[PDB]
Amino acid sequence: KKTRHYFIAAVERLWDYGMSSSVPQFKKVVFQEFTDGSFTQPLYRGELNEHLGLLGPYIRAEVEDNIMVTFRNQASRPYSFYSSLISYEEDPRKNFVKPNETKTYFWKVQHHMAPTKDEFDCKAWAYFSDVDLEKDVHSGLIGPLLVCHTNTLNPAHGRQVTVQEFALFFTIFDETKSWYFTENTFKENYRFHAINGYIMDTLPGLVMAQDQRIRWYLLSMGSNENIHSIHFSGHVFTVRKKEEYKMALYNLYPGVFETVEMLPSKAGIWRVECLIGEHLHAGMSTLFLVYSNKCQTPLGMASGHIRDFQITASGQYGQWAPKLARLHYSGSINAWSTKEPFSWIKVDLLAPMIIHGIKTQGARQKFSSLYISQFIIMYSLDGKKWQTYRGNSTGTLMVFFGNVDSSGIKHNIFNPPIIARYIRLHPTHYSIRSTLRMELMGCDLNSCSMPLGMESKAISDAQITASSYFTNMFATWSPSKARLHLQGRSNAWRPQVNNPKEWLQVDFQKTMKVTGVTTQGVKSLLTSMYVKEFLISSSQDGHQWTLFFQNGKVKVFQGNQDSFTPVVNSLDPPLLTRYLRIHPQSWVHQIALRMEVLGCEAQDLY
Amino acid sequence: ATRRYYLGAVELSWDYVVYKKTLFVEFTDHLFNIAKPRPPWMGLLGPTIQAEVYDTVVITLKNMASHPVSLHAVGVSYWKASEGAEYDDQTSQREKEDDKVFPGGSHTYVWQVLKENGPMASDPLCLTYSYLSHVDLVKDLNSGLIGALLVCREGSLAKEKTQTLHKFILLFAVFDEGKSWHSPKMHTVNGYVNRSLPGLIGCHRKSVYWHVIGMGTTPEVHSIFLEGHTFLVRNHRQASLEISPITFLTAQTLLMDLGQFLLFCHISSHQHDGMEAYVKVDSCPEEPKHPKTWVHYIAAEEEDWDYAPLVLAPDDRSYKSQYLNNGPQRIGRKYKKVRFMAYTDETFKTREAIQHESGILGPLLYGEVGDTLLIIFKNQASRPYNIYPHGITDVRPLYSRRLPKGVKHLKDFPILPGEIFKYKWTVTVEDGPTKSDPRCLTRYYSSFVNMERDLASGLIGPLLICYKERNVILFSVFDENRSWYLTENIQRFLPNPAGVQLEDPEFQASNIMHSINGYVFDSLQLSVCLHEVAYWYILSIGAQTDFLSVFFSGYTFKHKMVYEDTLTLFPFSGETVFMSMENPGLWILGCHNSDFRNRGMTALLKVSSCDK
Ligand SMILES: *[C@@H]1O[C@H](CO)[C@@H](O[C@@H]2O[C@H](CO)[C@@H](O[C@@H]3O[C@H](CO[C@@H]4O[C@H](CO)[C@@H](O)[C@H](O)[C@@H]4O)[C@@H](O)[C@H](O[C@@H]4O[C@H](CO)[C@@H](O)[C@H](O)[C@@H]4O)[C@@H]3O)[C@H](O)[C@H]2NC(C)=O)[C@H](O)[C@H]1NC(C)=O
Ligand SMILES: *[C@H]1O[C@H](CO)[C@@H](O[C@@H]2O[C@H](CO)[C@@H](O)[C@H](O)[C@H]2NC(C)=O)[C@H](O)[C@H]1NC(C)=O
Ligand SMILES: [Ca+2]
Ligand SMILES: [Cu+]
Ligand SMILES: [Zn+2]
8 A cells, every 4th residue: 555645835826716708916825736856847737626726736545545745835934734634753842834945744544534434435634734724724725635445546547536526615715814915904895705716606627427426525614604505506415424314505614524425417507606695695606517428429520510710720731721621521632731840720619618529530642641640639718818638637738649540530538528619739749741630529518419319210200290291103202201311212301292381390209408400402313302491490289380580580591502411500599399390491403301400308398 | 296386476574563575475376366375383484395206396486576586496406497596507598587587477497306306315204405586595585585395205295194293394594684675683483583483382292303494694603492302413412403504404302291392592692682482292182230329519619710820921012911911900810700619528628639631610420321410519609509400301309399489490499608409310311312422422510590690600510411331621711701700809809999891892801711621821731641542522611602613733533423623612512522542742722713712712732651
């Protein structure tokens, strides 16, 4: 069993919560995760622990283990380390560390500082400077220090692994305290109702799956007001203590670090708030996304659904542009490439989105393997100030592996999943030119942009009929053939006569939330038939249809241009329903429809 | 497996000559109207909604108010067109209609109750939660929008009819009336103030269950007691319920003895604020090794007291020299008090030795279930004082019941200066620890001739009721400002005491001694042998108004089979802990309240090697 070793220091920063949709300074002090004894590199905080915020880092350990925290006061005033557990030797009694000074504390974890067989796989414990047990908090020094059961933390790979851990900490930050009374007495203002130091909605980092159970490490701290009654909207938890108890609200007293586990409900973007009125409309709300990852789906660099703009380069080699950068682009006139040294390429997904993985590619030249070899990823959720991706516990940032040939097709998954509007890919090694075809794998925010079954045959056969259909002694263009990919004998729906006020009808079994529809044509050895333009009516009851308007507009949808090519329309307000019905207005040679539906499960019934 | 509730959000008019606001309610209509006959005591409380662990509740809200209001349930799940709260659903309006129902606005909700949302293996039969308006909280709570929401295992009054348990819904509400749509202040129990609220009845032999909801807008806390009677939470004997900010807990009473009993809130400044009502208990018809006698002779005794012994910090330089270092108008350090001292026999001269360890406290009363204490108490001192213990329930004078002379209860009966009285404190499992309980619960004994003068004058000591199978820390603030002796002390400790003034900004502080065991300012140290392992019976008592957060520098203690960092002490609770204690050095045991702990209020703890 191991010696955990932590290079931690105490740093001075600016603090703010000058949001994301004028603004105040504040020299606060924090615990900073450093790197070698030199305290030269600080350890870049990855997507992993983005949420810690104002906290210093997770100091983790198993029980039979040792902890060693070599600590450096890179600050202005004297501070200390101190937790409870931090146990000494024996025969002038105690300590603090002066500025520009290093102290070391090393001690064996006992079962006396661990979780009982009855608790949870880990227990959280608090650490903070005890130079002024009161002021050296408001100033900014607290972190969590987790003791875990043996064989629970994963070797080398950082710590734990099979549950996502998150540590929330609720205080009033009152900068009348804080050794830092610089400044830019009258009567009152600076009370921050902060969760890991983020007032109103600021706390940025709660990305978590709709499977993995989460344990949340909860802490309050100080002023006898700090009695924060914590709620997790539409979610419950369990508590350790004697036996396991199920609860929906847990009250924090000062100092009581509390470990609770939960398995999250339905996917989406929810809140955690201190339910005591005043305390809330003072800033406690803070959000978390539970995404599904049974929703990975192509972001549409496949089909030109990501239109020819919204893809940029650092530069390019002649023509051989990005744009031509889509996965599978054919011809040898294809894919982005520069021989310029350190290039990059960027997609505006034109909207905030979860992106689970990128698929990468090369290109033949004459007889010249042309592929991107190694690369890293950057991304932004706004546009201006960017970010680098360090997937799970790695080191400095996560290095990806591209192709090793002109057509091989690496699909690197975003382990923890990137959460951006924009995504930028910079090459680090290459074949002979950094060359790239690629598709993005992702899904919208709310995890609800998925195939609804038409193509899946997931939607039943006679779960669809239409306003009539063509059929004769030979063919049968049954409505039940309107299936996005279906290769068949006569393979699509077609009505018998061609009518402007014609339709095809899908009965969703239950009530479904719709993102949009992907439409299609057919070839009949005859000619290409497709629908050019169309309208959606929806119902609810079976016979009472209220057609899809857009904003006074009766939304006139933008259909295909060929036999093949799935072309897809999003929905203005996403459409809750049981009854869907596209309405071919003007077509090409015939009305002909293959098609699928996009979306998922809503308030099923009333 | 399905439960529709026709709920509506009406503004009516409150009280039992004052106040009037908007709150929840029943109705039976299909379109809008009257229909919902509501029972006595669910005061203003929105109707109690109640489902099982597979059922689906379907509240159809009507909002009849001029208020914009919602319907936010806690502890049950839904999609994002129930929940009824507005942030970043991100969703379309048929998905944000729940979030804020506008005045005149009917919109329906749906909650389900998955194997998940339901009550754990070994907790309660129904978990206590509740619902509310989540659109201005402070606006909405305070006006009257909170219904009781109960989630429940497979057995229930709408499936499994013979659930015949006796159960009320206690809502301990601090309603601010100037934070309403007031454009002032009630402070109740179910909407009933001072002590109306009829309901409250339990059957003599059997037991009674409370679904408790703490509610308020702000962190102001409570300590609820029910006369004579103790509680069950989780599974621990708790003799107070301790209601916080916003607290759903679910608790049991079991009422022997017929009568009427007040429950209420012990904390000081709430006394008149009138959160309290009566519970009665008359008989329903149903089908119409061998224990010891623990004996002590205890006395009330006027000694002088030194709050900070060997330790001076000379010069009025300080902020401590000011509580201690006596001055032109500050008694400081040394006051005349009246403690319990323990003597040897029927006569009272000569006793067992004073406690550097457990300072001001009277002697340690102990007794196991079955056991009987036997308190012969003499009062040597100038005021009628007495002894009652809190925790225990069987306290009669020794040879009879019929409590002497006039007094309808013994706690109030005063022992005259110079008389002796013989008391039998018999102990019974039903006021002692359970299997879950830290098997040896801490408690205290005092003088109820003037609940707190008689305490804040010097009269306490500790009491341990323990199971039928020592280190006492007491966190006390003594307000010498009203000792009974205050006056006497002044005419003896001060520049010939003319210019008096009891009331006085700064001076008044000089006499408020913040103390562990009657010792202040890192005076009182404790020795222990490193490795020697200890039970510590800690209690805040007479440490006026607030809660505590006790410390122990560099030490972890087992509070109720779990390992902790810092224990939390309400008013007149006393919690009992365990020191796996092999960590050497000088450790500053104070409290990580840093308000108090430099008004005095810390001790030191030395851990080092011995030789038994
Ligand atoms: C990035 O870093 C994070 C950790 O911080 C990790 O991210 C992902 O985490 C997952 C959780 O460990 C890993 O995948 C698997 O999850 C499956 C969950 O499904 C279970 O379902 C059953 C019901 O039948 C339940 O009882 C369980 O509690 C689960 O909910 C597991 O199946 C799986 O565990 C395995 O089970 C198989 C069964 O075939 C066994 O043969 C095997 O012994 C094993 O225990 C596992 O836990 C996954 O590591 C990871 N995924 C992704 C796409 O990122 C990763 O560690 C990091 N990702 C990297 C490096 O790519
Ligand atoms: C219940 O009634 C009222 C609260 O509304 C309390 O009345 C007190 O008495 C005075 C009389 O002048 C009032 O002005 C105040 O409302 C209170 N004042 C003081 C100084 O206490 C009363 O406390 C309550 N009754 C009980 C039994 O608790
Ligand atoms: Ca909603
Ligand atoms: Cu709070
Ligand atoms: Zn109260």
